[PDB]
Structures are given as structure tokens and as C-alpha cells.
Amino acid sequence: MQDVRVQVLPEVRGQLGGTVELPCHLLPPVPGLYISLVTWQRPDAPANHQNVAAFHPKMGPSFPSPKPGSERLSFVSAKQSTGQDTEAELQDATLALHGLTVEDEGNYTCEFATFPKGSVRGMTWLRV
Amino acid sequence: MQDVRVQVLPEVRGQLGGTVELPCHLLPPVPGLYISLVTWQRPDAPANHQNVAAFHPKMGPSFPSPKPGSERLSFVSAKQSTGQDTEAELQDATLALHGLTVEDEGNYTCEFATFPKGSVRGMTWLRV
Ligand SMILES: [Cl-]
Ligand SMILES: [Cl-]
Ligand SMILES: [Mg+2]
Ligand SMILES: [Mg+2]
């Protein structure tokens, strides 16, 4: 079973008041690897305020910080299961920020909690 | 819903050739918080070799580094579900190292991947 790694861009440039995407993908495809969770964190934030977005395969997204907050964040492509007919897909963890503010600038870390490989991460600087 | 934090000791002293435990507990009890995964990492290791142990609620433990490796690691108290009669318990992520070697010394990070709160961690220096 191959190791997995988090593919990101090192820097993304956004426009104030606009939307920007932070690509994040778990590579390569590894049959049998289970993605238990994905999170986005601001690693330079106070330690108890690092998590800004999370995604669970069965329960979907959460946004455990008021800023940027649910209203200004979306998982662009991640899918949760909503019934017997639908399966989760967390491999593309790309995050969008909406209504960009100056306080949104900085480092963002995309982390996949996987089994059996454990947790792996990649970091992007959002420049606004 | 209260934030959760990882409770650890800052330093644990082991004896060469012996067993040592690294306590790790997710606090406080939070009704509704789901623990998706726990991992133990060596944060000072090369980046692609940080994960040394993982625990999934349904699939149990994995040890994605040859050292210390499965033979020399155990989750002291974590429980997986093994059927309809049993439920997982990951809140106590305490790790034991066995047959301690000098190469085992250093920082160990215990991380819980939770929903909806995201991923939180605590770090302990194992002194041997
Ligand atoms: Cl590999
Ligand atoms: Cl709180
Ligand atoms: Mg928070
Ligand atoms: Mg490995």
C-alpha cells in the first residue's frame, strides 16, 4: 500500500470581496485507504482556534470557528453520504472562501485523517 | 458544544529494554462529539515518516512505520468494534512502547480527528 501525500499549491492569490479556491487533493489513488476526516486549519492561529472547517464522510461539513465561518466557506467538491444510494468522496478537499477579507490572509493547512496511513497535511498561503 | 483538548504529560521517562506508557486523553466529555481517528506521530521525523500508530473505531490499530513498529507498540485502552455487541472507545489514546531503544527517544504527538470540532493534538517528550 503506497503512502499518500497532500497535494496543494504553495500560494493562492484572492481578491478582496471575492471568492478564492484552495486546492487540496490526497494523492495517489490507494485502493483500501479509508479517509476518516478532512480538516482545514489556520496553523498560525491561537492553538484552540486552529480548526476552521471539517468534513466527515457520513455527516458532511462543519465550521468550528466563527471566522471565516460557514457563511463564507465551502468544500467545493467533497460529498457526504445522504442515504443508501450515495457514497462519500473526500479525496478532493478543495476549500472555497467567499467575500474575502484582509483577516482571511495567511497559512491554511489541509489535513486528511486516513486509515491505515494516519494523518497527512499540506499548507497553502492565501495572499489577499 | 464545548471545545475538546488533548491531555498529555509533557515528559515521560522510560527505561531501556522496558515498557513505557504515554498517556493521552481527549477532554472533557462532550456528548455528540465523534472521534473519527486517533494518530500518534513523531513530529521531528522526516515528513513522510511521521505516523507511527493510528486507530480507527471499526478497524482498530495500524502501525504505518517499521519503527517502533507493531511488535513494539500498543494502544493500552483503545477499543474497536468487533461486531454488533461491541462499540469503539477512542477517548483514551494512551500508547505503550515496548523493548525501549535509544532511537525511541523524542517527541510524540497524539492527535484526535473529531467531528464537528476537527483535529486537536498534544505532544510528549519520551526521555530514554
Ligand atoms: Cl510508498
Ligand atoms: Cl468551549
Ligand atoms: Mg473553534
Ligand atoms: Mg510510514
Curated annotation (Swiss-Prot), chains A, B:
Sugar-bearing residue positions: 107
Cysteine disulfide links: 24-110
Domain Ig-like V-type intervals: 2-126
Superkingdom assignment: Eukaryota
Localization, UniProt: Cell membrane
Effect of residue 59 to F: Loss of entry of HHV-1/Rid1 and HSV-2. No effect on PRV entry
Tissues with expression: Ubiquitous.
Function, as annotated: Modulator of T-cell signaling. Can be either a costimulator of T-cell function, or a coinhibitor, depending on the receptor it binds to. Upon binding to CD226, stimulates T-cell proliferation and cytokine production, including that of IL2, IL5, IL10, IL13, and IFNG. Upon interaction with PVRIG, inhibits T-cell proliferation. These interactions are competitive. Probable cell adhesion protein. (Microbial infection) Acts as a receptor for herpes simplex virus 1 (HHV-1) mutant Rid1, herpes simplex virus 1 (HHV-2) and pseudorabies virus (PRV).
Oligomeric and partner information: Can form trans-heterodimers with NECTIN3. Interacts with CD226 or with PVRIG; these interactions are competitive and have a differential functional outcome on T-cell activation, either positive or negative, respectively. Binds with low affinity to TIGIT.
Similarity comment text for this entry: Belongs to the nectin family.
Protein name: Nectin-2
Source organism of this protein record: Homo sapiens (Human)
